[PDB]
RNA sequence: CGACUCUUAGCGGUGGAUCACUCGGCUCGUGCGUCGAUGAAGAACGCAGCUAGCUGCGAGAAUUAAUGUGAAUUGCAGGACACAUUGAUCAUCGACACUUCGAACGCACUUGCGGCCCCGGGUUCCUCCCGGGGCUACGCCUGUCUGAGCGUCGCUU
RNA sequence: GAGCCUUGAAGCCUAGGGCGCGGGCCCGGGUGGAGCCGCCGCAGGUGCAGAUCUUGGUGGUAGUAGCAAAUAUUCAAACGAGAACUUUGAAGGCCGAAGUGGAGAAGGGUUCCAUGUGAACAGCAGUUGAACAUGGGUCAGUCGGUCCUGAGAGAUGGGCG
RNA sequence: UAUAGGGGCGAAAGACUAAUCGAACCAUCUAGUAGCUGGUUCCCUCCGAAGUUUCCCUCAGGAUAGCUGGCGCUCUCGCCC
RNA sequence: CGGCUACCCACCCGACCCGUCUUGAAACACGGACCAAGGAGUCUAACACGUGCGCGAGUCGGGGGCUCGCACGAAAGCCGCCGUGGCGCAAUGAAGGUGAAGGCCGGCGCGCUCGCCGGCCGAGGUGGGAUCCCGAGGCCUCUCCAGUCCGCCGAGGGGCACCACCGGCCCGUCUCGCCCGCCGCGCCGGGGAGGUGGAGCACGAGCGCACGUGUUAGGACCCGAAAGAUGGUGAACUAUG
RNA sequence: CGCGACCUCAGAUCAGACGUGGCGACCCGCUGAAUUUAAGCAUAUUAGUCAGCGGAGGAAAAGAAACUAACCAGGAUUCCCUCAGUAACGGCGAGUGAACAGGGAAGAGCCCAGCGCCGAAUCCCCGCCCCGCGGGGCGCGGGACAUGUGGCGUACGGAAGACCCGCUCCCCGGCGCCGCUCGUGGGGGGCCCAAGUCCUUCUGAUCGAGGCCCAGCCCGUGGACGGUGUGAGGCCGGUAGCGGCCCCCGGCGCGCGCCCGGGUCUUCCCGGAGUCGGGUUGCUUGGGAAUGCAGCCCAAAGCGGGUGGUAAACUCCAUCUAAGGCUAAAUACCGGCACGAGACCGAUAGUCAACAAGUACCGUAAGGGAAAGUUGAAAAGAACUUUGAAGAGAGAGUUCAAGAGGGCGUGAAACCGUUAAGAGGUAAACGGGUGGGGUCCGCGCAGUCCGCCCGGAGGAUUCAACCCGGCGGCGGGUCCGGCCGUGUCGGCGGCCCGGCGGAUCUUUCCCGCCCCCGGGGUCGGCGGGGGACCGUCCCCCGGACCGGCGACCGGCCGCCGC
């Protein structure tokens, strides 16, 4: 239950802080769930999804064993675009389709020192 | 309302421009100009009675009326039946008011606190909550209230010692003490008769805090239990003993029904 | 307008009273403000107790509730002087002074100088340095508490004087009937004007 | 037999009522106490690659610098993709900057007309000579400087 | 109420079946796509046929009145899908120098000019325009403001408040 | 350029004072007040009138009495009177 | 085959278009072209009466204080040497002030249209008055005897509540006469018998909460004026220099 | 004639510094109506308000008595409940209307002119040196202010000066650091639990039953939001005296600068002026023979002056000490900065404004002032063919669905088009009664009723009938054998190993005190503590009643399944 006085449980004010986050608080909106040997691997949760991270998709019209690369993260649309995840026109020309990233397995990530540092803050702040 | 729709400034026509005698906003151009002004009949007016904040809402009560329910309140939590017809499913509950021991008020997780209530039957009054909490109907779900969540058990305790911790977060449940005995906790709805879990120094408390009828309570400075209007009240133990029944008339069962 | 048998009403309403209309809705607010504010007295300011200034035996002037008592304000000077310390120092020790209350009564002044002789065997002081000017060691595990409610002494003491067993006893039973107010009474109304009838019979030889 | 009119039902057209939703109001309560002569509030004008409004800014003009976070903004081409260099965006912002009017302040405001000091060139100098920088409003306090008095007085012709 | 449901809630329509005397209600059938209801208490901004009722929409009127102040148009060709109206040739007229001409002050603010479109606008129409979209256009020592005072307006000294 | 609202200005009509002048316009007091017009929102059941006395600057109104409804209470028949 | 029905049509009879002002409306009285949405007795304070609950000669914490920092907790619980206070338990007077128990028995002063001493009873009496109590009497299949048994009652008695009347008591005035006591013997106090005025006493029924109706003041069921005041804006029309 | 000093003064673009203006919900000072009521309207009420003008702060104002009271007296200001709709005011009509008590939050008191004493021991400015981080002061040398009066000592509660007594050794403003505290000081950044498992519907899952006898899993976290639907676990959020870093403020402990109060006695000092007050005149108040403020005139005293609520004289008493000043708290806040919640409204409602809203637009201006939300999950916004010059169609295609096609959720009524059915001279429409037609519903239409018992016809099953075996229940006797309930005693037992209450006791108990003659006198008086007695619970046995919702065993009849 809520305890603080100074969050709210308000639908109006959630929804406004939701729709109107800057990006650094819409990078960790878009915060993806890992696959299960990588958090047993890593002893994470779940990471804030970038642009070369490597994705199965897990709901949708699209389920399962299609490892694929995203390309691009609309944080104004709250939408990842995933290479393998194709859609057609009227014309012939392939576009890709909207994703939720909560909706989405990393099943690799992108190394980097920065992404260790925050591996190793995860680690210790999960204790 | 507090600033009503009286920021328009307005004159009513008369006789000649013959629409009506309602005050009418005064300009040109913008076609509001010449609409309906201030008054309850008109678009973007005034309310009938703007609800002041004035209104007498709080409502004392006597505190023997309120001692006098939460009495009462406790007493219909003692018969099976009232609780039953309540609604807590009392099928598997072992004797009535539960009274748990000393242990219980010092639990510190909540496994051990739904191990406790698996054990003493309950969970299945919890799981009436768990099979009951759906969305609230109507335009309440937009002012944060979307939970048609039953009200279960209530455990009611003293020396706080992490039981509020074991109990917080079950749905249903209530977080209740001895000395602050509320009456919207203990009857919820107005309904009398909800199951509650005791402990053993809250039920040995209890005498304590408002005593028989013999002596007052010790607690409290002038409270009494009040006097009972019937001493015993078995009214078909009444009516068939045979003090009344030695002095009736007759059963007089015939009918004498209308006679062409 | 009017109607039946009914009380003959005239409400103060003919002002504007609808711009005035002070609702307490903050009255928990007040409340937990003023508990916050006597809290974080209590723990910031000092181990001082809280309604810190000791207040006198007083009593209250009518003939209504002169025969009750009250916590006043200050320990009337004279009634100091008698106790025997100076003014301010006084006032750093815990003593409420009011330079305004006088002295009528000997008893109400012996009273308060009782009360005075009572708080200053009650004080027990912490000086800065511990050199130990007019303390001791930590007495009574310093003193095992540091905050008093309501009032030091409870400065209310409604005295019962009970006077119970007597015997009815002699002629005053036939002495003290009802003639004796209405003496007094029309004594009091008649004093002066006697004294002018007398001073006229002096006069006129 | 058809036309027209009337009364229902189906379908279609005007219409936006009802129902459902709410980044909006309204009410109550808590916490803090904050504008300006170091140019306030307000107004004008300008600023985006494609940019009318709103929003954000002031010739450094859709923001600069710094800190934090950590791979984006996005409708489209572009451009730094570098991170074993300094690092995109976003938030905070404590450092710089902040056109003109405006208490508005050199005079009045017709973007008009001046007056001093200093600096660069034009006859290597002011003599009513182009550009740039600083100053030039009223009232008033403290102190300085200047001087008016047949107001009072000392010494002296 | 271990209530109802995306195997379809509210809402709406209905030559369907029914109940109550009525306030109204329940079910059948069709669109609809996410919330709804029965019972006991509680609290109302709680029920519409009117108020020359307010807001919004729609008929008869009605394809009716009307598109009549100032003498007037006509032939051929061209661009064009399309010409009573656009453009050019020619004819006939009007304004007739106190103009239906050539330029300014006040006012308008891009309406001035070129190109393209014709769904909006021009009370029919346009291939046309002062409509729309794109792109241009206003160059001063000697034209005027700027300088001066006119009727007057106005600040300091001062007075009043 | 000057005269600005109970003011201006008027060869005087009470004319003009931004389509308004026997007292302009805008906002506020202000949702001014009205014994005076118009209207006043679901069903069923039960009872059910008055336009008359007296008084009032009273005569289109109100007070009082009367007519009416609602809530009860005290009793009585229910077995030669 | 049956089917009433918000489907349509025909036939017989009856049937003027609603709302209100009015003695009278279908009116040659007024409003209404049609349809959807909004739209009018609310809220606060005070009073009165009735009802319901709690306590009951008391009642009420609405003002504060106490609990550990909890979403619901702006709730709830508690104070009692927090009852100060509001209302009620005492009224009558303009006020000084005064302020509700009387009766019986025995003895005595001249039981004298008169006071003292001891004991007892205690909110007086009359007529009505629900209920209640005692009970004559007779009543249960064939002989005396009995206990509750079936089974009422003539007549009498105590009398609730409330009504009518009489009487008594208190307070202010009015009339008439006599007595008593002194922290000091006076333009001092108190007492008695009758007649009146009071919203009184004559065993008290109030306090708090809630609901219903009615009235009042607040914009007060909704809409409506000719008007008045305060502060500002206009001589681009027109009037005049 | 000139020079100099003081005093009144003027000038500057002199050095330095200060006020203007905005917001204005709260507060302060002035001013100020009328609508309304009085059923009429002048006094009155509306109202010492609306409007207008001037000021500042997060509070402002007020604030240490020229007070209240009149008795067993209190004692700064503010705020709440009472006082109280009372005293009082009022064409005593309408109406208006306080205060002292008393209970609560807060508690904080003080300074100056005069009186004298200190050789002006005081203050501002200029210049160089001792020096500090992010910046400004103790000393050194000279220009002013000030003797027409700085500063210390002093304030009506008394103060000062000189002897006597016995003591106090003091403070507040720098500078580095230590462990901190009640939410575990302030705010800001980033991080922290647990299914996305198997089956099935769905376009999509957050839907649907289950996840071993340890209840699949986490819970100090089951608030809420977004996610293709209805989530505790899929995601930031939520709980936690949970954890780490950076930034800011406070209180301990090394130097620089200041440092004499209490009691007795003697002497001396002791106060705010055109001010109070009086007359008169206006406004205001509940304030009346005038509550407060103000104009004009008259205008003081020093055993004085004011107050004492009915004017005036005499007299007594109570209380205060004005015409100079500061001061936090509780209190108010519809402006602003962030913040949380709601028995509130849900696009004709709620602010005028959910949206490029004080916007479009109108008036010369003061000013007036709107309408207007929704495709889909994702534009996947309809490629391509064909008619037409295009607008617009016909096919095809995306989507669960164009029956969602760019003001596009749902799509009613008024109104209109077409189709289907029926009718038509008394304008249409209606009520009662039928008849005809049509849609639709229930049913099988010469074939539609069930449940019990009994006598016949054929097959298949095992109890029941009676007993043995068994657990579970109803019923009552001895109430066997124990618990518990009601009055009553007794053990007076926990009275010292007990709770509650008593204006019922104890001066032979104690302590702190008073009185009379360090001791004595209960000789008398105050408070507290110990016990003494009264009115209910805590054990015991024993009787009486009830064995009654209080329940077990032994046995009995009568039930019952297997
Ligand atoms: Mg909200
Ligand atoms: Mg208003
Ligand atoms: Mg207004
Ligand atoms: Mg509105
Ligand atoms: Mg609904
Ligand atoms: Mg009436
Ligand atoms: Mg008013
Ligand atoms: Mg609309
Ligand atoms: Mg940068
Ligand atoms: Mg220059
Ligand atoms: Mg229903
Ligand atoms: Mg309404
Ligand atoms: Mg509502
Ligand atoms: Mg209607
Ligand atoms: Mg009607
Ligand atoms: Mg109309
Ligand atoms: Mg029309
Ligand atoms: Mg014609
Ligand atoms: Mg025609
Ligand atoms: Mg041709
Ligand atoms: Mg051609
Ligand atoms: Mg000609
Ligand atoms: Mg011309
Ligand atoms: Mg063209
Ligand atoms: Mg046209
Ligand atoms: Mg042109
Ligand atoms: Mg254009
Ligand atoms: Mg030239
Ligand atoms: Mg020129
Ligand atoms: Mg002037
Ligand atoms: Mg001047
Ligand atoms: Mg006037
Ligand atoms: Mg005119
Ligand atoms: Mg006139
Ligand atoms: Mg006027
Ligand atoms: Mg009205
Ligand atoms: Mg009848
Ligand atoms: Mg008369
Ligand atoms: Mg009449
Ligand atoms: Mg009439
Ligand atoms: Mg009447
Ligand atoms: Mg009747
Ligand atoms: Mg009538
Ligand atoms: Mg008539
Ligand atoms: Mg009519
Ligand atoms: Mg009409
Ligand atoms: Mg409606
Ligand atoms: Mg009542
Ligand atoms: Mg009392
Ligand atoms: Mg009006
Ligand atoms: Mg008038
Ligand atoms: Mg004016
Ligand atoms: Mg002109
Ligand atoms: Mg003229
Ligand atoms: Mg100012
Ligand atoms: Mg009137
Ligand atoms: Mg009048
Ligand atoms: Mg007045
Ligand atoms: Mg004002
Ligand atoms: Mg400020
Ligand atoms: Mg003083
Ligand atoms: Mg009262
Ligand atoms: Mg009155
Ligand atoms: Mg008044
Ligand atoms: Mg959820
Ligand atoms: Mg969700
Ligand atoms: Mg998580
Ligand atoms: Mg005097
Ligand atoms: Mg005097
Ligand atoms: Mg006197
Ligand atoms: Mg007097
Ligand atoms: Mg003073
Ligand atoms: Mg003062
Ligand atoms: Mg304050
Ligand atoms: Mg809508
Ligand atoms: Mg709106
Ligand atoms: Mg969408
Ligand atoms: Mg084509
Ligand atoms: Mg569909
Ligand atoms: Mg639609
Ligand atoms: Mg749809
Ligand atoms: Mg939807
Ligand atoms: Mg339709
Ligand atoms: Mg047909």
Redesign the pocket.
């Known amino acids: 239950?809520?305890?603080?006085?100074?969050?709210?449980?308000?639908?109006?004010?959630?929804?406004?802080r939701?729709?109107?986050?800057?990006?650094?608080?819409?990078?960790?909106?878009?915060?993806?769930?890992?696959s299960?040997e990588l958090?047993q691997k890593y002893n994470?949760?779940?990471?804030?999804?970038?642009?070369?991270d490597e994705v199965q998709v897990?709901?949708?019209?699209?389920?399962?064993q299609q490892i694929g690369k995203?390309v691009?993260?609309?944080?104004?649309?709250?939408?990842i675009y995933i290479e393998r995840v194709q859609?057609?026109?009227?014309?012939?020309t392939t576009?890709h389709?909207?994703?939720?990233?909560?909706?989405?397995?990393i099943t690799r990530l992108?190394l980097?020192?920065?992404?260790k540092?925050?591996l190793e803050?995860?680690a210790?702040?999960?204790? | 309302?507090?600033?009503?729709?009286?920021?328009?400034?307005?004159?009513?026509?008369?006789?000649g421009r013959?629409?009506?005698?309602?005050?009418?906003?005064?300009?040109?151009?913008?076609?509001?100009?010449?609409?309906?002004?201030?008054?309850?009949?008109?678009?973007?007016?005034?309310?009938?009675?703007?609800?002041?904040?004035?209104?007498?809402?709080?409502?004392?009560?006597?505190?023997?009326?309120?001692?006098?329910?939460?009495c009462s309140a406790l007493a219909a939590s003692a018969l099976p039946a009232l609780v039953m017809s309540?609604?807590?499913?009392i099928e598997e509950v072992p004797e009535l008011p539960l009274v748990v021991e000393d242990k219980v008020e010092g639990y510190?997780?909540?496994?051990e606190?739904?191990?406790l209530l698996?054990?003493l039957k309950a969970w299945?009054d919890i799981?009436?909550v768990?099979?009951?909490?759906?969305?609230?109907?109507?335009?309440?779900?937009?002012?944060?209230?979307?939970?048609?969540?039953?009200r279960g058990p209530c455990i009611i305790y003293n020396?706080?010692?992490?039981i509020?911790?074991?109990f917080?977060?079950?749905?249903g449940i209530?977080?209740?003490?001895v000395?602050?005995?509320?009456?919207?906790?203990l009857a919820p709805?107005?309904?009398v008769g909800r199951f509650c879990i005791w402990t053993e120094s809250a039920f040995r408390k209890l005498?304590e805090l408002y005593g028989?009828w013999?002596?007052?309570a010790?607690?409290?400075?002038?409270?009494?239990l009040?006097?009972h209007?019937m001493i015993?009240?078995?009214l078909s133990?009444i009516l068939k003993s045979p003090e009344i029944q030695r002095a009736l008339?007759?059963p007089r069962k015939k009918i004498h029904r209308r006679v062409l | 307008?009017?109607?039946?048998?009914?009380?003959?009403?005239?409400?103060?309403?003919?002002?504007?009273?609808?711009?005035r209309?002070?609702?307490?809705?903050?009255?928990?607010?007040?409340?937990?403000?003023?508990?916050?504010?006597?809290?974080?007295?209590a723990?910031?300011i000092a181990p001082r107790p809280?309604?810190?200034?000791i207040?006198?035996?007083?009593?209250?002037?009518?003939?209504?509730?002169?025969?009750?008592?009250?916590?006043?304000?200050?320990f009337?000077?004279?009634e100091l002087?008698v106790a025997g310390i100076?003014?301010?120092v006084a006032?750093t020790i815990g003593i409420?002074?009011?330079?305004?209350?006088?002295?009528?009564?000997t008893?109400?002044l012996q009273a308060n100088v009782?009360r005075l002789?009572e708080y200053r065997s009650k004080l027990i002081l912490f000086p800065?340095?511990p050199?130990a000017?007019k303390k001791g060691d930590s007495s009574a595990e310093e003193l095992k508490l540091a905050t008093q409610?309501?009032g030091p002494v409870?400065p209310?003491?409604?005295?019962?004087?009970?006077?119970?067993?007597r015997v009815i006893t002699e002629e005053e039973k036939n002495?003290k009937?009802?003639?004796?107010?209405?003496?007094?009474?029309?004594?009091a109304?008649?004093f002066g004007?006697?004294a002018k009838?007398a001073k006229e019979a002096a006069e006129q030889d």
């Open positions: 239950m809520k305890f603080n006085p100074f969050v709210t449980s308000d639908r109006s004010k959630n929804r406004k939701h729709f109107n986050a800057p990006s650094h608080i819409r990078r960790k909106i878009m915060s993806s769930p890992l299960k958090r994470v949760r779940s990471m804030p999804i970038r642009k070369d897990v709901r949708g019209h699209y389920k399962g995203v691009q993260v609309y944080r104004k649309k709250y939408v859609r057609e026109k009227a014309n012939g576009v389709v909207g994703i939720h990233p909560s909706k989405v397995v992108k980097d020192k920065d992404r540092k925050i803050r995860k210790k702040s999960r204790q | 309302s507090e600033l009503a729709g009286h920021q328009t400034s307005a004159e009513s026509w008369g006789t013959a629409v009506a005698r309602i005050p009418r906003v005064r300009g040109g151009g913008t076609h509001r100009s010449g609409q309906g002004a201030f008054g309850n009949m008109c678009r973007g007016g005034r309310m009938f009675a703007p609800t002041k904040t004035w209104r007498r809402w709080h409502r004392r009560v006597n505190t023997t009326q309120k001692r006098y329910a939460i309540k609604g807590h499913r510190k997780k909540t496994k606190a739904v191990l698996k054990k299945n799981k009436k768990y099979a009951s909490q759906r969305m609230r109907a109507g335009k309440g779900k937009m002012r944060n209230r979307r939970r048609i969540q039953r020396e706080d010692n992490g509020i911790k074991a917080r977060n079950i749905p209530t977080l209740l003490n000395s602050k005995l509320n009456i919207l906790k709805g107005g309904h005498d028989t013999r002596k007052a010790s607690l409290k400075s002038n409270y009494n009040p006097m209007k015993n009240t078995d133990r008339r007759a | 307008a009017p109607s039946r048998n009914g009380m003959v009403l005239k409400p103060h309403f003919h002002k504007d009273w609808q711009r209309v002070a609702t307490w809705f903050n009255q928990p607010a007040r409340k937990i403000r003023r508990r916050k504010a006597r809290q974080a007295k723990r910031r809280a309604s810190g200034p207040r006198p035996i007083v009593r209250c002037p009518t003939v209504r509730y002169h025969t009750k008592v009250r916590a006043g304000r200050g009337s000077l004279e002087r100076h003014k301010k006032r409420s002074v009011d330079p305004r209350r006088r002295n009528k009564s008893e109400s009782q002789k800065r340095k050199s000017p409610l309501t409870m209310v003491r409604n005295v019962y004087k009970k006077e119970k067993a002495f009937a009802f003639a004796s107010l209405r003496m007094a009474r029309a004594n109304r008649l004007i006697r009838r």
